[PDB]
Structure formats: structure tokens, C-alpha cells
Design a protein around this ligand. Structure first.
Ligand code: BOG
Ligand code: BOG
Ligand code: BOG
Ligand code: TRP
Ligand code: NA
Ligand code: NA
Length: 509
């Protein structure tokens, strides 16, 4: 069974896992829609009571399960909890990361398509100066790439270039994954993370130099880092902060677990985990938070920046930022550094999203890595056509897989590992072989605070958001729900087959 060759490589893979589009696209938007500093306070609390505790749990389970020749939650849950239901609950450990990949890798291919276009300088050019007049050419640039429907029909019509770029993006993903953990994920991680960090730092440094009558990037930084206690009372920001912490650290997806299942039985996870997490957070709060927002505040001011943030998840990064850059010296090339950055950020994450599926086919169905990778790619590529052609389908998958799903699963694995499997055995399995030990206080957070914190949160989310689901929405949302539900059924079947092959290979040996 493959292992991480070096400690550094492991850290970088785990950090490349968490450091993605969420750091440079999602965080700024989330931080802005919530008043900046108002969002930061709950964000810090979430990182301590949730982000970190659960972080160690997933490493513990990954390494615990990895020892016994398993890298996925269906099998691992069964080990921590010998029950047929524990295997069915573990199916999400394959479903969630697989669903996320379906739309994530597509957004990833965008950054690749923009990077290329920007490199060759095949971009729009606004005349020298109205915000709408300069932004419009960029909106039209994105809407033409992904093929936003002009007509009432909710149908997307992506360009030939966009479609092929997706093929390439998938191909690049496969080329890395087909090499395995050390030769592939780890090898690429070492080169990708440093590069990423360099690009980010350069962009942050370059962004600061932005200066206009409307303001400066210095103002924007004061907006996000200004603590406001008035908004603290609202649950909206708490749910936003905790949802972001989950997405950024990649928790409740089962991806961290698969990666960690390649860590050696006694090898440290306490420090290793802590570090990789800290790397993501440092990159998110410092690097990701200093580019998008400060640039918009500079060129547009705060109020209008928040307006742009609330406008869309891609508006800031795919339209505004490139437009803001097109006004600066060497903006187009700077746009290429931006999208190239994103592409490496997403690529290190998309490979981690497909690894659980790859690990399952290998560990449980005894498929060669070559076959495990090609079929997984085939499933992701095929499934992605829904996201590419069916308007709003992307939104749907992100809500269930990357939003509601990851929290439900976070509480599940936490309960199984600590409550069912035993709180003390979990503690040993976590601290065992740890270069350092987990603070005794976190023992109580894990067993009591985190699950209660999550439980209450989920209920609150259910009380206000549940009415919305199926109450009123376009019927096309069912096309996505129908498919992703079928995805779960298909994954349940494989689990069923994996348990049956296990039975024959027991009597025959
Ligand atoms: C490569 C796999 C076979 C093609 C999958 C069938 C659907 C893709 O269809 C393709 O969509 C593109 C974007 O709309 C168009 O530009 C292409 O002309 C069209 O062939
Ligand atoms: C890394 C670059 C990938 C190859 C780029 C191929 C996509 C561009 O293809 C172009 O698409 C246009 C719109 O459909 C057509 O008008 C052109 O005839 C066609 O060459
Ligand atoms: C919804 C998931 C499946 C989407 C696949 C759509 C395949 C595209 O379908 C074809 O696209 C052509 C453009 O290249 C159009 O000219 C044709 O009219 C259309 O049949
Ligand atoms: N964590 C990545 C994106 C992501 C979300 N869930 C994941 C699950 C597995 C791998 C990556 C992810 C980011 O910060 O942008
Ligand atoms: Na990444
Ligand atoms: Na992240």
C-alpha cells in the first residue's frame, strides 16, 4: 500500500488539498457579504472549535483505517462501528467528494481557459472610464465562455474552446493521479505549493500598490480586519463562517481521510495535521483576503465592493478583478498570474476530490490504479455535462455536497469516532506517534463542544432553510437531484458488491 515518501511532501499534499478556489474565491466573498470584521470573529472561533478538532479526527481515522488496508469511510466507519448502517453512512464519504469534483473541476478548467486566453492576450479591452462600461466587456467575456442562456430556457451553451479546455483539465488531473500518491500527488504538490505561494505573495504585493481617488487597498484591509460586535448576534454570519471553515479545510468530505490513509501507522498526524491546516488558514486570511477585496475597494470603494461581492460567486474573480487589472500597467499579464494561480490552487484540490473514489475501487474492488483512475475520470467527466449544459445545476450540487452534506458528515464521523468507537480510544489513536500531543482541553471540545456546536448549528440551518427546499424552486433542480441521488444508489451498489467479493475471498482462502 502506497505511503507518503517524505514528511514535507505529505504536508504539501495536505496543504494543496485544502488550499484551493475556496481560499481565493469563496473566502473574500463570504467575508465581504458579512461586513468583513464581523465575519472574522466567528470565523476564528469556528477554526478552534470545529476546524482544528475535526481536522485531527479525520487524520486519526485515515491513519487508523489505512493501517488495515482501507482508505475510505464506508470501510473505516465499519471498523469504528461494526454495523451495516455504518457502511451505508460511509457512502457519503465517496458521494460528497465525487459530487464536489463534478462542478469543481469545471470551475477549475475556467481558470485554465482564462489563464491561456490572458497569456496570449486574447481578452476584451475597455476604453479609457465608467465602471459599467469597463466591466460589461468582461461580463460578456465570461458569459460567452460558459454560454449563459440569453433566452428564457435554462440551458447553457459553452464554447468549443471551453469544452476542450475541460477535456484538457480532466486530462491533466488524470496524468497526475495515475502516477499515484508519492510519484503523482506528492511530486506535484512540492512544485505546486511553492509556486502558488510565490504567485500569491506577488499579487498581494502588487495589489497594495493600487491607488485611486476611490480609495486604496489599505482601506479594504481595514474593512475586513475591523471587528464589529453588533453583527455577532446574528446567526447568519455564524452559519456563513462555519460553512466556510468546512469548505476551506475540506472537512466532512472524507478527502482528508483518504489522504491520511497513506500515512504510516505510527507516523505523526498531530503536528502534521496542525501544520497543513495552519498553512491553508494563513494563505486564506492573508493571501486570498488581500487580493480580491482590497483591489475592489481601491477602484470602487467599500460600499460598492460589498455590492459586487453580493452580486455573485464569480463576479469578483472572473469579471471585476480582471477588469480592475485591465486598467493597470501590464494588467493582462497580471490577469494571467491571477488565473494561473487559481488553476494550480484548484488542481491540487481536484486531485484530492477524486482520490477517495480511486482509493475505493483499489482497496475494496482490487482494481489497478490505472483502471481505478480512468473509470473515476470517466464518471466525473460524464457527470460534468449536467453542470456544463443545465443552468443552475452547479448551484444545486454545491448546496447539497459542499454545504449541507459536509456538515452532516462532519458530525457523523465525529460521533462515530468519539462516541461510538469510544472517546478514549479516539484520543490514543490521535496522539499516538504524535511529534507533539493535542492539548488536553481539546479532548473535551471534541467530545462535547464540537458535536453540540454542530448539532445546534444544523438545527438553526434547518429551521430557516428547510422551508425553502422544494417549497419554491425551478423544476430543473430535480434533474440534478435525480442524478446525484442516483449517484448515491450507484455507490451503495458498489459497497454491496465490495462486501460480497470479500465473502468469496474468505471461503477460498
Ligand atoms: C468528447 C465526448 C463526446 C462529446 C460529448 C457530447 C456533448 C458535447 O457536445 C459538444 O459541446 C460543445 C460545447 O457546447 C460544442 O462546442 C461541440 O460542438 C459539441 O460537440
Ligand atoms: C490550448 C488551446 C486549445 C485549442 C483551442 C481550440 C478552440 C478554438 O477553436 C476555434 O473556435 C472558434 C469558435 O468555435 C471557431 O470559430 C474557430 O474556427 C476555431 O478554430
Ligand atoms: C444536458 C447534458 C447533455 C448535453 C449535451 C448536449 C449536446 C449538444 O447538442 C447539439 O449541440 C450542437 C452544438 O454543438 C447543436 O448545434 C445541436 O443542435 C445539438 O443537437
Ligand atoms: N478545500 C478546498 C476546496 C474543497 C472543498 N471540499 C473539498 C474536498 C476535497 C478536496 C478539496 C475540497 C478549498 O479551500 O478551496
Ligand atoms: Na488546492
Ligand atoms: Na482552503
Amino acid at each position: 500500500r502506497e505511503h507518503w515518501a517524505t514528511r514535507l511532501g505529505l504536508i504539501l499534499a495536505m496543504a494543496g488539498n485544502a488550499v484551493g478556489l475556496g481560499n481565493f474565491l469563496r473566502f473574500p466573498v463570504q467575508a465581504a457579504e458579512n461586513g468583513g470584521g464581523a465575519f472574522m470573529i466567528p470565523y476564528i472561533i469556528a477554526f478552534l472549535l470545529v476546524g482544528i478538532p475535526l481536522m485531527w479526527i479525520e487524520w486519526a481515522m485515515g491513519r487508523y483505517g489505512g493501517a488495515q488496508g482501507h482508505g475510505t469511510t464506508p470501510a473505516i466507519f465499519y471498523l469504528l462501528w461494526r454495523n451495516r448502517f455504518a457502511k451505508i453512512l460511509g457512502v457519503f464519504g465517496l458521494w460528497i467528494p465525487l459530487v464536489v469534483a463534478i462542478y469543481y473541476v469545471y470551475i477549475e478548467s475556467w481558470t485554465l481557459g482564462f489563464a491561456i486566453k490572458f497569456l496570449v492576450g486574447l481578452v476584451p479591452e475597455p476604453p479609457p472610464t465608467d465602471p459599467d462600461s469597463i466591466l460589461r466587456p468582461f461580463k460578456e467575456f465570461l458569459y460567452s465562455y460558459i454560454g449563459v442562456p440569453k433566452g428564457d430556457e435554462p440551458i447553457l451553451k459553452p464554447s468549443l474552446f471551453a469544452y476542450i479546455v475541460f477535456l484538457i483539465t480532466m486530462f491533466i488531473n488524470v496524468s497526475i493521479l495515475i502516477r499515484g500518491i508519492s510519484k503523482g500527488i506528492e511530486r506535484f504538490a512540492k512544485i505546486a505549493m511553492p509556486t502558488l505561494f510565490i504567485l500569491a505573495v506577488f499579487l498581494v504585493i502588487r495589489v497594495f500598490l493600487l491607488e485611486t481617488p476611490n480609495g486604496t487597498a489599505a482601506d479594504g484591509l481595514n474593512f475586513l480586519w475591523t471587528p464589529d460586535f453588533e453583527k455577532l448576534k446574528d446567526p447568519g454570519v455564524w452559519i456563513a463562517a462555519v460553512g466556510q471553515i468546512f469548505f476551506t479545510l475540506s472537512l466532512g468530505v472524507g478527502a482528508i481521510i483518504t489522504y491520511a490513509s497513506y500515512v504510516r501507522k505510527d507516523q505523526d498526524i498531530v503536528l502534521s495535521g496542525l501544520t497543513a491546516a495552519t498553512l491553508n488558514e494563513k494563505a486564506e486570511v492573508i493571501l486570498g483576503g488581500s487580493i480580491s477585496i482590497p483591489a475592489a475597494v481601491a477602484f470602487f470603494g467599500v460600499a460598492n465592493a460589498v455590492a459586487i461581492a453580493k452580486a455573485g460567486a464569480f463576479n469578483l474573480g472572473f469579471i471585476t478583478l480582471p477588469a480592475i487589472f485591465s486598467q493597470t500597467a501590464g494588467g493582462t499579464f497580471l490577469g494571467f498570474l491571477w488565473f494561473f494561480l487559481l488553476f494550480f490552487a484548484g488542481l491540487t484540490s481536484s486531485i484530492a476530490q477524486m482520490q477517495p473514489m480511486i482509493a475505493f475501487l483499489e482497496d475494496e474492488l482490487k482494481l489497478s490504479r490505472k483502471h481505478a483512475v480512468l473509470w473515476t475520470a470517466a464518471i466525473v467527466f460524464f457527470s460534468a455535462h449536467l453542470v456544463m449544459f443545465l443552468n443552475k445545476s452547479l448551484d444545486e450540487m454545491d448546496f447539497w455536497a459542499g454545504t449541507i452534506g459536509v456538515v452532516f458528515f462532519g458530525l457523523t464521523e465525529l460521533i462515530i469516532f468519539f462516541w461510538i468507537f469510544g472517546a478514549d480510544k479516539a484520543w490514543e489513536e490521535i496522539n499516538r506517534g504524535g511529534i507533539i500531543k493535542v492539548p488536553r482541553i481539546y479532548y473535551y471540545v471534541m467530545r462535547y463542544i464540537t458535536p453540540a456546536f454542530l448539532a445546534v448549528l444544523l438545527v438553526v440551518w434547518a429551521r430557516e432553510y428547510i422551508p425553502k427546499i422544494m417549497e419554491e424552486t425551478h423544476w430543473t433542480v430535480w434533474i440534478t437531484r435525480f442524478y446525484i441521488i442516483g449517484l448515491f444508489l450507484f455507490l451503495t451498489f458498489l459497497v454491496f458488491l465490495a462486501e460480497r467479493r470479500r465473502n468469496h475471498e474468505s471461503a477460498g482462502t
